[PDB]
């Protein structure tokens, strides 16, 4: 039977261990009794994934004991024999059998992947790719596995082509998940930032382009808005107008969180990216006017633009002319908006300018801070 075959496959390792001074024959017999129990539990009916986990833990501690015994007796870090890789091969085989039998246990899949990544020198990139291929075919609608695949390929191999292909296939399978779009934008921004800093490194060693601009991330942004809106409508499909307004509000939050990612990206042209996203939101969506449909969100976007005109610049090195231009834009927006909207926008702008400059610098310390306090009192 299968248990007998697997035990007879375990035999040559114990031949090697007895041949070296590492283990006594009785100790080998006790180890094989435990392995007999575990192999019977795996190959019988009524098994669980916990039996696989316990067997892997047992083999791991056997390997640790073997390492200590090889350090102590022979005074060598490792022998050149079968026994130093055979337990590792067995643990990989137990993981493979467990994933084949219960493919739905994502924790066991993660344990398999972590183990195969951890034994880096002995494993193969081909093996990690095969485990990813099996797992991605079995669970194509799990976004985290696609993200982990792309992350492994980006940090370990720095394979930007494979990372792009992984993200594109994953978004083909999961077009409704905002998280995968976000990670794709983050990867592309990381790639172009690394290209920019690599060009800068070259320019300092020795002696434009839409790729360096960020138009790839902008196109991913636009396709994200269309696809996420369409799939959100398909999931939740006068009342249609209310649903469209709710969809626009839902997309607005993801857009603002993309804005926060752009603000996190300091090296990139934040002003360019914010200009593009506010251009998109200035363009009408869902057959309704944005400002008329969501005046609170329109006022929020106007205040966001007015603040981010100078928010990229530090408060210590703030430009009085830029602050005056922002205040003039705020006054124009207040004139355009309703009186309650103008009052709310003025209060928000005053609070933002206060938290920017008034807490940072004193009116006695800076002569321009007195003018800022006067402008805040006027607002």
């Amino acid at each position: 039977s299968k248990t007998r075959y697997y035990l007879e496959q375990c035999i040559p390792e114990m031949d090697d261990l007895v041949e070296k001074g590492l283990f006594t024959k009785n100790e080998v017999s006790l180890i094989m009794k435990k392995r007999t129990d575990f192999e019977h539990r795996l190959n019988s009916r009524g098994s669980s994934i916990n039996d696989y986990i316990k067997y892997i833990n047992y083999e791991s501690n056997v390997n640790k004991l073997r390492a200590k015994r090889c350090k102590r007796i022979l005074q060598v870090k490792k022998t050149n024999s079968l026994s130093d890789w055979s337990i590792q091969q067995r643990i990989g085989f137990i993981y493979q059998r467990g994933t084949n039998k219960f493919p739905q246990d994502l924790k066991f899949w993660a344990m398999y992947l972590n183990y195969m990544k951890a034994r880096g020198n002995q494993t193969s990139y081909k093996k990690i790719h095969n485990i990813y291929n099996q797992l991605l075919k079995l669970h194509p609608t799990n976004v985290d596995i696609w993200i982990s695949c792309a992350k492994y390929e980006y940090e370990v191999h720095a394979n930007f082509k494979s990372c792009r292909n992984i993200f594109q296939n994953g978004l083909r399978f999961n077009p409704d998940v905002p998280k995968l779009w976000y990670e794709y934008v983050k990867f592309e921004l990381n790639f172009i930032t690394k290209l920019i800093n690599r060009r800068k490194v070259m320019g300092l060693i020795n002696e434009t382009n839409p790729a360096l601009r960020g138009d790839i991330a902008l196109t991913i942004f636009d396709v994200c808005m269309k696809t996420l809106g369409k799939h959100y409508i398909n999931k939740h499909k006068k009342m249609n107008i209310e649903l469209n307004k709710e969809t626009l509000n839902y997309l607005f939050s993801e857009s603002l969180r993309y804005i926060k990612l752009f603000d996190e990206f300091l090296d990139l042209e934040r002003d360019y990216l914010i200009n593009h996203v506010l251009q998109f939101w200035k363009n009408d969506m869902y057959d309704l006017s944005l400002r008329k449909d969501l005046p609170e969100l329109y006022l929020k976007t106007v205040m966001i633009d007015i603040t981010l005109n100078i928010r990229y610049m530090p408060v210590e090195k703030l430009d009085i002319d830029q602050l005056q231009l922002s205040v003039k834009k705020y006054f124009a927006y207040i004139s355009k908006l309703d009186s309650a909207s103008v009052k709310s926008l003025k209060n928000e702008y005053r609070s933002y300018l206060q938290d920017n400059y008034l807490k940072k610098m004193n009116a006695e310390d800076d002569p321009r801070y007195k003018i800022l306090d006067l402008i805040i009192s006027k607002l």
Binding site: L7, E8, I11, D15, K25, V28, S29, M32, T36
Partner: protein, 515 residues
């Protein structure tokens, strides 16, 4: 193909070619044999248990001084409970038998009280009060059927205890046995006839006439299913159902042979006679190894365990020897070490059933236990090192279930071995006939042999050649003419007479020339 220490028991014995296909095929056969033997010996890492032992730490410590109470206190509770005592004062004495699994026990009193039980569970399968003289009982292929040798006829009962069969052909049997691969129930007794009965079909396979009076003892060789009978003339005879005469006759004792035991490997046999002599024989080579002479009292029973312990019961005593079956003279069983001589094999254990007489002995299979039947029932003695620790679940499973028993019954029935396959040597099936030619003869060689046989008459090679040097007293032609019938005259005898006359004339001429 690395060489291994335990390879010897996995080795198998066997009783320069120009052909390239044959050379490569024989090379493949030898390679596969060596690989299979090494890979079989490599599986001793997978043995789950180890045999028991009883070791003395000091020089003052003797193993035969160790008592059953001390052993029962020392060993674990399950084995202490397995050592069971049954007091049955009325219908004694009791002859005991164990199942080949060892999970069932079959006791038989002389006054007709026959019981089958699951001794470890404490569950009684059957209990019969026959009110009749009963001598022996045995289990059949399971615990489901058992045979009892009653006063005249032998009876077969099922698991619950109903009579299935009354075997009129088996008369006054005192000894019962079962061959578990041939499904043969073997009876011997007062009539001096050995009878083999097929329990599956119901046909009596063999009636053999021992011609030596009532059979005093009977054992089976588990290796080759040959029955060793012990007669009152002092000979053990070896019987096969396909032959009317015994295969081997061994002159073992002077008086009647009290008991016979054969070890599991079938290589050693122990007999006790009424002459107070216990003899250990090699079976395969048919020499005797040891002859312990003048026991204090004649040994009533011998038993041999699966590990190789030898148990001798003489009246109230039971003594066991360890490593007594070996070839060396240091392995001869003795009773006392004369001043602590290590070459003397003092008994491994001893026990006394005071005021009792041991009826029969049987080692519990795969347990460290020896069951003793006696005048008041049964006891189990704990004997560390007695039973085989590692069994095989395909052959005999002590933890067998009902459905596993049901499947194993049909499996063994399908693979029942025919009675004609029983030989002295189990490796005779598949061999070339002994009368047949050692080398293969093709058409050309057979035609050449036929031509030689035809030309032999013309070349006169049939008659012996004339030898003048050989005297006429011992001459082959003289013996040929003497062995031929006097009245009948044939051409061959005429040529033999002419050649004998010519050789006699030549010898006379040579003698005259010398003289």
């Amino acid at each position: 193909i690395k060489e291994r220490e335990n390879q010897n028991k996995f080795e198998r014995s066997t009783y320069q070619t120009k052909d390239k296909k044959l050379r490569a095929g024989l090379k493949k056969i030898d390679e596969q044999y060596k690989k299979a033997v090494s890979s079989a010996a490599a599986t001793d890492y997978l043995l789950p248990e180890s045999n028991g032992y009883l070791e003395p730490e000091n020089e003052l410590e003797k193993t035969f001084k160790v008592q059953q109470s001390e052993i029962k206190s020392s060993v674990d509770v399950s084995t202490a409970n397995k050592a069971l005592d049954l007091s049955l004062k009325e219908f004694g004495p009791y002859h005991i038998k164990y199942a080949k699994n060892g999970t069932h026990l079959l006791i038989t009193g002389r006054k007709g009280h026959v019981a089958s039980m699951d001794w470890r569970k404490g569950q009684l399968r059957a209990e019969l009060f026959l009110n009749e003289t009963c001598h022996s009982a045995t289990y059949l292929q399971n615990e489901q059927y058992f045979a009892v040798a009653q006063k005249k006829y032998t009876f077969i009962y099922d698991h619950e205890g109903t009579e299935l069969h009354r075997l009129k052909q088996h008369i006054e049997a005192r000894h019962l046995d079962f061959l578990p691969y041939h499904y043969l129930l073997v009876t011997a007794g007062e009539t001096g006839w050995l009878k083999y009965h097929d329990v599956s079909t119901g046909q009596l396979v063999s009636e053999l006439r021992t011609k030596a009076g009532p059979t005093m003892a009977m054992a089976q060789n588990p290796w080759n299913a040959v029955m060793h009978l012990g007669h009152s003339n002092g000979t053990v005879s070896l019987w096969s159902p396909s032959m009317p005469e015994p295969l081997v006759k061994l002159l073992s004792a002077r008086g009647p042979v009290n008991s016979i035991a054969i070890d599991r490997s079938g290589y050693y046999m122990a007999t006790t006679g009424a002459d107070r002599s216990m003899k250990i024989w090699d079976i395969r080579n048919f020499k005797q190894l040891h002859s312990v002479e003048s026991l204090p009292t004649p040994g009533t029973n011998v038993s041999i365990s699966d590990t190789g312990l030898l148990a001798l019961s003489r009246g109230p005593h039971v003594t066991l020897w360890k490593d007594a079956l070996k070839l060396s003279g240091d392995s001869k069983p003795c009773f006392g070490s004369m001043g602590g001589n290590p070459h003397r094999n003092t008994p491994y254990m001893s026990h006394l059933f005071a005021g009792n007489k041991v009826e029969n002995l049987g080692f519990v299979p795969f347990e460290d236990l020896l069951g003793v039947g006696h005048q008041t029932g049964i006891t189990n003695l704990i004997v560390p090192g007695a039973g085989e620790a590692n069994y095989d679940a395909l052959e005999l499973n002590p933890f067998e279930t009902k459905k596993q028993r049901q499947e194993q019954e049909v499996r063994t029935l399908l693979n029942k071995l025919p009675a004609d396959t029983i030989t002295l040597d189990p490796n005779s099936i598949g061999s070339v006939d002994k009368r047949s030619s050692t080398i293969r003869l093709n058409a050309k060689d057979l035609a050449q042999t036929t031509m030689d046989a035809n030309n032999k008459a013309k070349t006169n090679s049939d008659i012996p050649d004339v030898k003048p040097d050989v005297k006429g007293k011992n001459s082959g032609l003289r013996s040929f003419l003497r062995k031929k019938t006097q009245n009948v005259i044939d051409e061959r005898k005429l040529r033999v007479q002419k050649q004998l006359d010519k050789e006699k004339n030549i010898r006379k001429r040579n003698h005259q020339i010398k003289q």
